[PDB]
Design an enzyme around this catalytic site. Structure first.
Site, PDB file in Angstrom:
ATOM      1  N   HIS A  69     -36.354  -8.797   7.779  1.00  0.00           N
ATOM      2  CA  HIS A  69     -35.612  -9.829   7.069  1.00  0.00           C
ATOM      3  C   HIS A  69     -34.484  -9.163   6.298  1.00  0.00           C
ATOM      4  O   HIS A  69     -33.580  -9.838   5.812  1.00  0.00           O
ATOM      5  CB  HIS A  69     -36.522 -10.643   6.134  1.00  0.00           C
ATOM      6  CG  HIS A  69     -36.935  -9.928   4.886  1.00  0.00           C
ATOM      7  ND1 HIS A  69     -38.007  -9.061   4.846  1.00  0.00           N
ATOM      8  CD2 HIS A  69     -36.479 -10.021   3.612  1.00  0.00           C
ATOM      9  CE1 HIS A  69     -38.200  -8.659   3.603  1.00  0.00           C
ATOM     10  NE2 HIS A  69     -37.286  -9.226   2.833  1.00  0.00           N
ATOM     11  N   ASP A  93     -42.357  -8.351  10.544  1.00  0.00           N
ATOM     12  CA  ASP A  93     -41.198  -8.128   9.685  1.00  0.00           C
ATOM     13  C   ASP A  93     -40.843  -6.641   9.619  1.00  0.00           C
ATOM     14  O   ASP A  93     -40.473  -6.117   8.561  1.00  0.00           O
ATOM     15  CB  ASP A  93     -41.477  -8.643   8.267  1.00  0.00           C
ATOM     16  CG  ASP A  93     -40.219  -8.745   7.414  1.00  0.00           C
ATOM     17  OD1 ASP A  93     -39.107  -8.736   7.976  1.00  0.00           O
ATOM     18  OD2 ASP A  93     -40.343  -8.845   6.176  1.00  0.00           O
ATOM     19  N   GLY A 149     -34.921  -6.371  -3.886  1.00  0.00           N
ATOM     20  CA  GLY A 149     -34.147  -5.208  -3.512  1.00  0.00           C
ATOM     21  C   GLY A 149     -35.000  -3.990  -3.274  1.00  0.00           C
ATOM     22  O   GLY A 149     -34.484  -2.905  -2.992  1.00  0.00           O
ATOM     23  N   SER A 151     -37.943  -4.248  -1.158  1.00  0.00           N
ATOM     24  CA  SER A 151     -38.740  -4.369   0.060  1.00  0.00           C
ATOM     25  C   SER A 151     -38.258  -3.264   0.996  1.00  0.00           C
ATOM     26  O   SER A 151     -37.122  -2.802   0.866  1.00  0.00           O
ATOM     27  CB  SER A 151     -38.566  -5.754   0.717  1.00  0.00           C
ATOM     28  OG  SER A 151     -37.326  -5.864   1.386  1.00  0.00           O
TER      29      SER A 151
HETATM   30  C1  LIG Z   1     -39.488  -9.973  -4.608  1.00  0.00           C
HETATM   31  C2  LIG Z   1     -39.152  -9.080  -3.645  1.00  0.00           C
HETATM   32  C3  LIG Z   1     -39.652  -9.200  -2.252  1.00  0.00           C
HETATM   33  C4  LIG Z   1     -39.990  -8.057  -1.309  1.00  0.00           C
HETATM   34  C5  LIG Z   1     -38.845  -9.031  -0.964  1.00  0.00           C
HETATM   35  N1  LIG Z   1     -39.243  -9.737   0.204  1.00  0.00           N
HETATM   36  C6  LIG Z   1     -39.032 -11.065   0.341  1.00  0.00           C
HETATM   37  O1  LIG Z   1     -38.317 -11.737  -0.395  1.00  0.00           O
HETATM   38  C7  LIG Z   1     -39.806 -11.717   1.489  1.00  0.00           C
HETATM   39  C8  LIG Z   1     -38.932 -12.085   2.687  1.00  0.00           C
HETATM   40  C9  LIG Z   1     -39.638 -13.264   3.369  1.00  0.00           C
HETATM   41  O2  LIG Z   1     -40.920 -12.853   3.901  1.00  0.00           O
HETATM   42  C10 LIG Z   1     -40.805 -12.525   5.227  1.00  0.00           C
HETATM   43  N2  LIG Z   1     -39.597 -12.619   5.907  1.00  0.00           N
HETATM   44  C11 LIG Z   1     -39.474 -12.398   7.268  1.00  0.00           C
HETATM   45  C12 LIG Z   1     -40.671 -12.067   8.016  1.00  0.00           C
HETATM   46  O3  LIG Z   1     -40.607 -11.746   9.373  1.00  0.00           O
HETATM   47  C13 LIG Z   1     -39.374 -11.941  10.075  1.00  0.00           C
HETATM   48  C14 LIG Z   1     -41.944 -11.972   7.375  1.00  0.00           C
HETATM   49  C15 LIG Z   1     -43.172 -11.699   8.124  1.00  0.00           C
HETATM   50  C16 LIG Z   1     -44.458 -11.636   7.439  1.00  0.00           C
HETATM   51  C17 LIG Z   1     -44.453 -11.839   6.011  1.00  0.00           C
HETATM   52 CL1  LIG Z   1     -45.850 -11.584   5.049  1.00  0.00          CL
HETATM   53  C18 LIG Z   1     -43.286 -12.128   5.208  1.00  0.00           C
HETATM   54  C19 LIG Z   1     -42.021 -12.197   5.878  1.00  0.00           C
HETATM   55  C20 LIG Z   1     -40.008 -14.064   2.114  1.00  0.00           C
HETATM   56  N3  LIG Z   1     -40.337 -13.006   1.115  1.00  0.00           N
HETATM   57  C21 LIG Z   1     -41.035 -13.085  -0.054  1.00  0.00           C
HETATM   58  O4  LIG Z   1     -41.249 -12.120  -0.773  1.00  0.00           O
HETATM   59  C22 LIG Z   1     -41.581 -14.464  -0.421  1.00  0.00           C
HETATM   60  N4  LIG Z   1     -42.998 -14.330  -0.747  1.00  0.00           N
HETATM   61  C23 LIG Z   1     -43.892 -14.539   0.252  1.00  0.00           C
HETATM   62  O5  LIG Z   1     -43.572 -14.878   1.354  1.00  0.00           O
HETATM   63  O6  LIG Z   1     -45.159 -14.268  -0.076  1.00  0.00           O
HETATM   64  C24 LIG Z   1     -46.257 -14.544   0.803  1.00  0.00           C
HETATM   65  C25 LIG Z   1     -46.256 -13.624   2.058  1.00  0.00           C
HETATM   66  C26 LIG Z   1     -47.527 -14.243  -0.049  1.00  0.00           C
HETATM   67  C27 LIG Z   1     -46.254 -16.014   1.260  1.00  0.00           C
HETATM   68  C28 LIG Z   1     -40.904 -15.061  -1.658  1.00  0.00           C
HETATM   69  C29 LIG Z   1     -39.351 -15.303  -1.482  1.00  0.00           C
HETATM   70  C30 LIG Z   1     -41.531 -16.487  -1.896  1.00  0.00           C
HETATM   71  C31 LIG Z   1     -41.247 -14.059  -2.833  1.00  0.00           C
HETATM   72  C32 LIG Z   1     -37.456  -8.479  -0.985  1.00  0.00           C
HETATM   73  O7  LIG Z   1     -37.178  -7.790  -1.953  1.00  0.00           O
HETATM   74  N5  LIG Z   1     -36.536  -8.717  -0.012  1.00  0.00           N
HETATM   75  S1  LIG Z   1     -35.038  -8.193  -0.545  1.00  0.00           S
HETATM   76  O8  LIG Z   1     -34.665  -8.949  -1.694  1.00  0.00           O
HETATM   77  O9  LIG Z   1     -35.090  -6.740  -0.598  1.00  0.00           O
HETATM   78  C33 LIG Z   1     -33.729  -8.505   0.697  1.00  0.00           C
HETATM   79  C34 LIG Z   1     -33.994  -8.599   2.261  1.00  0.00           C
HETATM   80  C35 LIG Z   1     -34.083  -7.492   1.864  1.00  0.00           C
END
Ligand SMILES: C=C[C@@H]1C[C@]1(NC(=O)[C@@H]1C[C@@H](Oc2ncc(OC)c3ccc(Cl)cc23)CN1C(=O)[C@@H](NC(=O)OC(C)(C)C)C(C)(C)C)C(=O)NS(=O)(=O)C1CC1
Ligand SMILES: [Zn+2]
Length: 194
Positions: A69, A93, A149, A151
């Site tokens: 993602h 992911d 930021g 992940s």
């Molecule tokens: C707070 C920081 C967190 C770590 C973070 N990741 C997120 O935001 C993730 C992204 C999305 O999840 C997933 N996408 C695509 C997938 O495959 C293509 C997935 C396949 C399997 C699973 Cl597991 C999840 C997947 C939603 N999400 C959440 O974390 C969501 N949480 C969530 O989904 O939690 C549960 C899994 C418990 C439902 C939510 C927005 C609600 C917090 C981040 O920092 N990203 S980032 O800003 O660096 C920028 C892109 C790089």
């Protein structure tokens, strides 16, 4: 599709975990379109960006892993030109390229440790209780904004091995209660299979 570009690194090899920024948000855009990045790489964890988002990538088993993602299908910029992905599991992911020269790989954990540590883009290291295969509770709950930021960064055991890759936050009303990660064994399954 531009290239994913390294704009920094976190080192985990000393007595001190630190971040060091390597590229301004002007060399990033240029590096991104051409996919040529001449900058020397160092560290177990790379701070990377696409056009408007920054996140982390972690080196394990000679592969630089990050989240789908985040990177998408994108190549990553390297001294030789754009590098195409070697692994891509969307269900997981998960994305990975061959590790750039200079990138030291973490060893995958075999401790069974239940006590973990999340590494943030800030080289902050945060206590985590493993509660399942792919979940851990934060001892100190942090707001969601805090974890953004990070992940693609590692979950570590007390001996500094890689337990997995931070993927999603389990969040309740703007607060992060726990984290979901890709277990290091899923990386290895991904590596063995056509
Ligand atoms: C707070 C920081 C967190 C770590 C973070 N990741 C997120 O935001 C993730 C992204 C999305 O999840 C997933 N996408 C695509 C997938 O495959 C293509 C997935 C396949 C399997 C699973 Cl597991 C999840 C997947 C939603 N999400 C959440 O974390 C969501 N949480 C969530 O989904 O939690 C549960 C899994 C418990 C439902 C939510 C927005 C609600 C917090 C981040 O920092 N990203 S980032 O800003 O660096 C920028 C892109 C790089
Ligand atoms: Zn271990």
């Amino acid at each position: 599709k531009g290239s994913v570009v390294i704009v920094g690194r976190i080192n985990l090899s000393g007595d001190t975990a630190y971040a060091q920024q390597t590229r301004g948000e002007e060399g990033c855009q240029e590096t991104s379109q051409t996919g040529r990045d001449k900058n020397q790489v160092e560290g177990e964890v790379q701070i990377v960006s696409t056009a408007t988002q920054t996140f982390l990538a972690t080196s394990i088993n000679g592969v630089l892993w990050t989240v789908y993602h985040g990177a998408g299908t994108r190549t990553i910029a390297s001294p030789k030109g754009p590098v195409t992905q070697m692994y891509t599991n969307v269900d997981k992911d998960l994305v990975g390229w061959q590790a750039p020269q200079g990138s030291r790989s973490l060893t995958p954990c075999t401790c069974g440790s239940s006590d973990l540590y999340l590494v943030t883009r800030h080289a902050d290291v945060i206590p985590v209780r493993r509660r399942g295969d792919s979940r851990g509770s934060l001892l100190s709950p942090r707001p969601i904004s805090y974890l953004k930021g990070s992940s693609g960064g590692p979950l570590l055991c007390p001996a500094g091995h890689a337990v997995g890759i931070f993927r999603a936050a389990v969040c309740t009303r703007g607060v992060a209660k726990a984290v979901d990660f890709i277990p290091v064994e899923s990386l290895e399954t991904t590596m063995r299979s056509p």
